[PDB]
Design a protein around this ligand. Structure first.
Ligand SMILES: *[C@@H]1O[C@H](CO)[C@@H](O)[C@H](O)[C@H]1NC(C)=O
Ligand SMILES: *[C@@H]1O[C@H](CO)[C@@H](O)[C@H](O)[C@H]1NC(C)=O
Ligand SMILES: *[C@@H]1O[C@H](CO)[C@@H](O)[C@H](O)[C@H]1NC(C)=O
Lengths: 241, 48, 48, 98, 49
């Protein structure tokens, strides 16, 4: 089905610290009060410039992501998994099957069968959320974890996402998939676009609130004044062309 | 006042591009069939 | 408020390239020799 | 056999660091950012993904050295005008400087 | 900042406060007489009259 991304999908745009300035940024963000999907636990989805991703369960049934362009051999791809604690990242060719997953019977196999000329390796209720952005040869990943009590419902709250890793490849990515863990015998997807936001920092370089300028006239009024409070009066904001 | 001098500081030195397994290998190959081991993200010390 | 806003605008006007390659006197100098960096320096001077 | 690919550069040599100096006027450079000023310890808190600070008016004021992972703050070195106080050459030639 | 300097005012705030206090004392005690020369004392009730 569908649900509405209320005020989620905000990440730190850079490594810069600010004490109390309300900083306005022009970058890729998920629009406020946007339309997102209601997947249950799954098919393949496109990977336009940016994507959102949120998961929420008490049982670890969701594990890792699969990225690439054709999701077959002959095309470079990105793979992330976590068996129990060893996070594995691979950026190289693979041959994924029609039903890749890992059961927890209690067997755990059947994701892919291929390994050749591989260019990188690495070994390392609750709400989980990730933002994936691939630009100019780099791959950005942001994360945040917030304990909740809702079973499988998207909550009402604001939380910034901190950068996690970054890796240089210089490839083009168009589609991606996901793994699961059900048996052997619950996630969200959002789409990013160029927008304009102003952020709030409280003496510790932590993003506590944000306002999307293009949402409604009040928001662009706040953006013009560069303040979260507006006094009585009339203000000029833009033009009707 | 004028600055006394210029100082530069950079992070520690990471994985060292293990040339030691290419210049001190136990057995090289014949010229008609030569290895093509390639390096990747790491710090290379050409001074040594 | 007006004095502070005017001074802040004057400060913010420094971070503008004015159609040049950059808005810093160093990076323009450090990557281009005087013969063609002089044009960029002139544009920055005119804007400021 | 080196090469230059459209992909970002990944492999290259070690940058030669030098000893940091505090409470003097020097020309700092940490991972690309460069300028002058006085280096001093700052009672601030950063986040493990946060390199340097920028205050109001978009100025670099705090930087964390990438050797000790501690925050330092930078302030411009002393600048100011010089004024001359004189009683007039018709009276005396003594001069006070402010 | 980068070349910006804020000069301090010549008359510090307590000095201006002292001017204001002197003006108030003169107005209360001598009425308008001190504005034309030497201050001439007069009871406040008669000045209001
Ligand atoms: C999201 O879009 C679908 C069709 O694309 C629509 O049926 C649904 O009502 C939309 N959700 C919201 C919250 O507008
Ligand atoms: C922000 O920092 C102050 C001290 O600098 C601290 O008291 C406060 O708890 C911090 N806020 C957080 C961590 O949300
Ligand atoms: C200025 O100079 C003239 C002639 O030298 C002299 O008569 C006069 O007293 C001087 N006045 C002052 C204030 O120095």
């Amino acid at each position: 089905a569908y649900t509405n991304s209320f005020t989620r999908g905000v990440y730190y745009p850079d490594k810069v610290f600010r004490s109390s300035v309300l900083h306005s940024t022009q970058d890729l963000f998920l629009p406020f009060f946007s339309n997102v999907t209601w997947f249950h636990a799954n098919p393949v989805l496109p990977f336009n410039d940016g994507v959102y991703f949120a998961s929420t369960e008490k049982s670890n049934i969701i594990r890792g992501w699969i990225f690439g362009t054709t999701l077959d051999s002959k095309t470079q791809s990105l793979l992330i998994v976590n068996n129990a604690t060893n996070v594995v990242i691979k950026v190289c060719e693979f041959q994924f099957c029609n039903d890749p997953f890992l059961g927890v019977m209690e067997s755990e196999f059947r994701v892919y069968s291929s390994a050749n000329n591989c260019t990188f390796e690495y070994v390392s209720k609750n709400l989980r959320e990730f933002v994936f952005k691939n630009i100019d040869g780099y791959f950005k990943i942001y994360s945040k974890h917030t304990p909740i009590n809702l079973v499988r419902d998207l909550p009402q709250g604001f939380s910034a996402l901190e950068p996690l890793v970054d890796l240089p490849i210089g490839i083009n990515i168009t589609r991606f998939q996901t793994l699961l863990a059900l048996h052997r015998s619950a996630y969200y997807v959002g789409y990013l676009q160029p927008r304009t936001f102003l952020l709030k920092y409280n003496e510790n370089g932590t993003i506590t609130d944000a306002v999307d300028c293009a949402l409604d006239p009040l928001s662009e009024t706040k953006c013009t004044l560069k303040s979260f409070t507006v006094e009585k009066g009339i203000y000029q904001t833009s033009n009707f062309r | 006042v004028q600055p006394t001098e210029s100082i530069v500081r950079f992070p520690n030195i990471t994985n060292l591009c293990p040339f030691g397994e290419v210049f001190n290998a136990t057995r090289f190959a014949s010229v008609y069939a030569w290895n093509r081991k390639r390096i990747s993200n790491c710090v290379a010390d050409y001074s040594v | 408020n007006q004095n502070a806003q005017a001074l802040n605008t004057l400060v913010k006007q420094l971070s503008s390239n004015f159609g040049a390659i950059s808005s810093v006197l160093n990076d323009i100098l450090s990557r281009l020799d005087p013969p063609e960096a002089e044009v960029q320096i002139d544009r920055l001077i005119t804007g400021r | 056999s080196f090469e230059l690919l459209h992909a970002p550069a990944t492999v290259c040599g070690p940058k030669k660091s030098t000893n940091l100096v505090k409470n003097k006027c020097v020309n700092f450079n940490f991972n690309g950012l460069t300028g002058t000023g006085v280096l001093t310890e700052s009672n601030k808190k950063f986040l493990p993904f946060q390199q340097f600070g920028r205050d109001i008016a978009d100025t670099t004021d705090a930087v964390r050295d990438p050797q000790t992972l501690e925050i330092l703050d930078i302030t411009p070195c002393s600048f100011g005008g010089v004024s001359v106080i004189t009683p007039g050459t018709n009276t005396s030639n003594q001069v006070a400087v402010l | 900042f980068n070349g910006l300097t804020v000069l301090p005012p010549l008359l510090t705030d307590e000095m201006i406060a002292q001017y204001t206090s002197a003006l108030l004392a003169g107005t209360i005690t001598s009425g308008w007489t001190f504005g034309a020369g030497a201050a001439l004392q007069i009871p406040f009730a008669m000045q209001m009259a």
